[PDB]
Design brief:
The structure is a homotetramer of 312-residue chains. Chain A has 312 residues and is an alpha+beta fold. Chain A has 2 domains: 1-176, Fructose-1,6-Bisphosphatase, Chain A, domain 1 (2-Layer Sandwich), CATH 3.30.540.10; 177-311, 3-Layer(aba) Sandwich (D-Maltodextrin-Binding Protein, domain 2). In chain A, α2 runs antiparallel to α3 and α4 (198-208) crosses α7. In chain A, the strands form 2 sheets. The first copy, chain A, has an 8-stranded mixed sheet, with helices on both faces. Chain A has a 5-stranded mixed sheet with strand order 10-9-11-13-12, sandwiched between helices. Chain A has helices spanning 7-11, 23-43, 50-63, 198-208, 225-235, 254-267, 298-309; strands spanning 68-73, 80-81, 87-98, 109-117, 138-144, 148-154, 157-164, 169-177, 185-187, 218-220, 238-241, 271-273, 293-296. Chains in contact: A-B, A-C, B-D, C-D. At the A-B interface, α2, β7, β10 and α5 of A face β8, β10 and α6 of B. The complex binds thallium (I) ion (12 copies). One thallium (I) ion binds next to β3 of chain C. Chains A, B, C, D: GO terms for molecular function: AMP binding; fructose 1,6-bisphosphate 1-phosphatase activity; identical protein binding; metal ion binding; monosaccharide binding; RNA polymerase II-specific DNA-binding transcription factor binding. Chains A, B, C, D: This is Fructose-1,6-bisphosphatase 1. Chains A, B, C, D: One of its GO terms (cellular component) is nucleus. Chains A, B, C, D: Mg(2+) 1 binds at residue 74.
């Protein structure tokens, strides 16, 4: 096909008619090189830590885009303040290999990422990173499934891209994605049944045993955030990782997990909340600050927020 | 790798020990070709039903193997009788592509197959396929996730090969696989909560709220039989697709879904029962009949089985 | 490897420390997408005109870099003046599939390219393209051989890049390349023996039968410009496609053949001449204007220029 | 493609007609695996001798085939005798990787092999390999250029398969190949001009300056035997590596270079003579002996042969 839409071309038709210098583009391009290598390594996984190496990889490519100043990793303490010579205006937040554990069982996992723009006239510090999701310029993730699909959500909406392994380019496959309004799938680890706050518990029973005599929601849960979000994004559904006492303020770190997802979600007509407040407005204080997250189709997030409101 | 132990080097080398004709090797070598092609089809089945390409593909590779004579496919009303010029001693039942609907959400999908030996002297027929799972000589499945995997269970063991895309060969990685006795995961579509029979519903409870003040089991359910079974085999645990009111005879078909996995399971030291009898011991009356299926790490399936006749 | 040098990263460390906006980079990146697709299509050539499609491809990607204004193809009459919305400052000259004929015999072929910068304050026209090689900002070519290697020569020197088919990135493999000073290979189509100008003819006899009793030069000639230049670039050697009467002013078009090569050559310490004047200083008058070209190791070009001088 | 005719589907299907044991198929299937791996090794043998990985690889695949017993490799002083546990009825001579030095310049390289049947009853030995080329039962070569090709010539024809990297299978593309009677290309290292014998040197002349006021032949010489032979087979013409003073016995070794190509040539209706006798009719005395080789479209080789005894 003589007219292929590589994501490079596509972001160049978002971040160029907008006159913004297309810095974004080189940052994104670089993320692709890293995402691609992670996919190859993972496909041949069992024939050749992976996340450390994928961390190193992401960082290196990132720096070299000459479009970053601060970087936060799940795998790193201090947010990496990019050296001066290669600086640029963006703050990138990431989980390079989400699900490192799950490779062994061959379950789809991914590289999540959040991006910010430094809102200051100074020298970078991890404070430049402590902005809330409402200030994300773009967030996305790449899933290493039966295909390697990159989902990128910028201010206009969400577009899925898939890796054509032959030409090695993320090709555009879905434009301006919008989630289903209501779903039929609730995804959550019911092993934690006992420790669930009552709001959640009433909800699970409402999905399993619908009072208003419909059919019970189908339970799903790959147990990989990337996978469950994506099934949620396309097929609709509600995904919940509320807090219990074991992980008292939840398990998913805000910064580069709850937030990038929640942004992708909201741009696609999907709510994302902690249970009290939306995940995109919490003022982030520690780069590794955790937060509960409930995302998915609006009419379900809402069917649960009512319930949460009806309990305090 | 220099002395690359291909699936074929492996199957041919063990085949030599039966002082045989070479058809197992031909069969499997040909099946492999359907698998690579399906894997490739799936890795880009979003850049622009599938079941059928996958299906026609399998029938084709298998006819030409000169090793088949009766083929039972999920997709065909009747069995397929291999033309004489090309008939051989084996009978293959297979689901060519499992969970096809699940490919939109990027769920790890697969091809499951079971191979029988035509023991009788008359014209090949369905009856030959109407053998108990116990009788199989070879089984496994090919998984299509982050990597393409082929687990093959024969008289001597269950083994795992992963396709190396660089060379288009299936290479041996896990040898003589054995499942953990007891483990921490139950896998079941909890959406059918109101449908389940008491035995199950008590067991679910026992795992979430464990009576011995222990750690509860985790919940998993990818919703693609192959991903869940492969998880159950590698990490240990239990998977269940019990009969319920929407499906009193089970959902997962016997000949091509239940019996192969069942066989692979028992060969690794797990069990697979319908709660009332071994899956492999069922004598199929119809080539398309279903079965309840509870497979996994022994002690757990057992814990269940007791609950069955603790309720009998 | 966590620190991969993709050509994107490499040109970004040439066209960024130089403050030039890295427009160049997106142009180059785009050429890579096209180059990559051509390689895939060609590898699977005999299992699926190719140059028309590769022409269309190059053009499309090119336009979309938002870095071009004029484009000249071997396969096109009127140099394509890029539409305004996607304009930029560069003029790109190219032969998308050099050797279209040779695919059938499985001989390495390539995509050559020359780049200019519009030296005017107006509306683009093919005049913007009629600059001589001395005004090329960068020239290169990609070879579709047993590997797909891109050779890129900018003002600093030449760097070879090779396609790592797994991650799909041109990885850097040779920095600041310099040709051998003297060679031992003369490459030319001696079928044309008869029509050769005497300067050339004395030279062939001097290579075959060395008067100063050394050993005869090895004759080579893949009969694909890309291939012969590249063998010339690395192993040294002299490549000659002088004019005869059949192709009286030679066969290779200046614009996107003789010139990009000659530039690559000169930046690597290799002369390139028509026989009278250097190929990089001829004022180009017709985009399809032809020119003789002799390139390669300095001490040989020179061993031949003497001879040419000694004949007029 | 659905009914993909693999090299194996092909070799197995013709093998059935000899009412055989299945070793040709095993042999070739195993050889294929060495080829893919070498192709892959070459496609990235610049991102960081080779002969040896390639070599060890071939010996390995072939021992394990359970089809060999004597193996004659370019690289080993002595023949390799397959251990009894693994011996079978075939003898394979092969150059594992040809023109290794030519990989730096990206020259299309290849693996050439010839297979014999051990007819005698004693312990396998060199003598078995000391058979005339006429006696071969199977031959061909695998080319590694823009695409990886496997030409296989057996009793019934010469056929061409191209490796489809997407599936890791060699697929049949050209069927029952036949060379053109006469054609327009001579191929020879003209660097040895002062070394050649009169017969050749007159013939060269006759083609450059054709006496019948005709179109001269074109000159080609990639300098990698496989590329030139494959060209000669597909497009017609002549290739020559005549004996000269630097090499009076020819350069190209007989058993593994000359005889296979020779066989492939004659099977397509070309000829291959040393100028004094058919290449295939030579009875090798040493497994490493060389031969003069002139192969190609009949009429031309003939035109030469006459010149031989027009000079006798
Ligand atoms: Tl992680
Ligand atoms: Tl994480
Ligand atoms: Tl997490
Ligand atoms: Tl299916
Ligand atoms: Tl199924
Ligand atoms: Tl099923
Ligand atoms: Tl061309
Ligand atoms: Tl050209
Ligand atoms: Tl040309
Ligand atoms: Tl060699
Ligand atoms: Tl050789
Ligand atoms: Tl040779």
């Amino acid at each position: 096909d003589t007219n292929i839409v590589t994501l490079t071309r596509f972001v160049m038709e978002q971040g160029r008619k907008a006159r913004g210098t297309g810095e974004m583009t080189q940052l994104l391009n670089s993320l692709c090189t890293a995402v691609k290598a992670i996919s190859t390594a993972v496909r041949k996984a069992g024939i050749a830590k992976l996340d450390v190496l994928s961390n190193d990889l992401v960082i290196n490519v990132l720096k070299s885009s000459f479009a970053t100043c601060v970087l936060v990793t799940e795998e790193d303490k201090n947010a990496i303040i990019v050296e001066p010579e290669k600086r640029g205006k963006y703050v990138v937040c990431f989980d390079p290999l989400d699900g490192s554990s799950n490779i062994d069982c061959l379950v789809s996992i991914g590289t999540i990422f959040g991006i910010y723009r430094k809102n200051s006239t100074d020298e970078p510090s991890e404070k430049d990173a402590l902005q809330p999701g409402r200030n994300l310029v773009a967030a996305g993730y790449a899933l290493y499934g039966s295909a390697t699909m990159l989902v990128l959500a910028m201010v206009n909406g969400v577009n899925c891209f898939m890796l054509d392994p032959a030409i090695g380019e993320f090709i555009l496959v879905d434009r301006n994605v919008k989630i289903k309004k209501k779903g039929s799938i609730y995804s959550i680890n019911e092993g934690y049944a006992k420790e669930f706050d009552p709001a959640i518990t009433e909800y699970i029973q409402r999905k399993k045993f619908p009072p208003d005599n419909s059919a019970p929601y189908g339970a799903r849960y790959v147990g990989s955030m990337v996978a469950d979000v994506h099934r949620t994004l396309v097929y609709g559904g509600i995904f919940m990782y509320p807090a219990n006492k074991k992980s008292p303020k939840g398990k998913l770190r805000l910064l580069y997990e709850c937030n990038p997802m929640a942004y992708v979600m909201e741009k696609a007509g999907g709510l994302a909340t902690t249970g009290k407040e939306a995940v995109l407005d919490i003022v982030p204080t520690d780069i590794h600050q955790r937060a509960p997250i409930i995302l998915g189709s609006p009419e379900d997030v809402t069917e649960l927020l009512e319930i949460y409101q009806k309990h305090a």
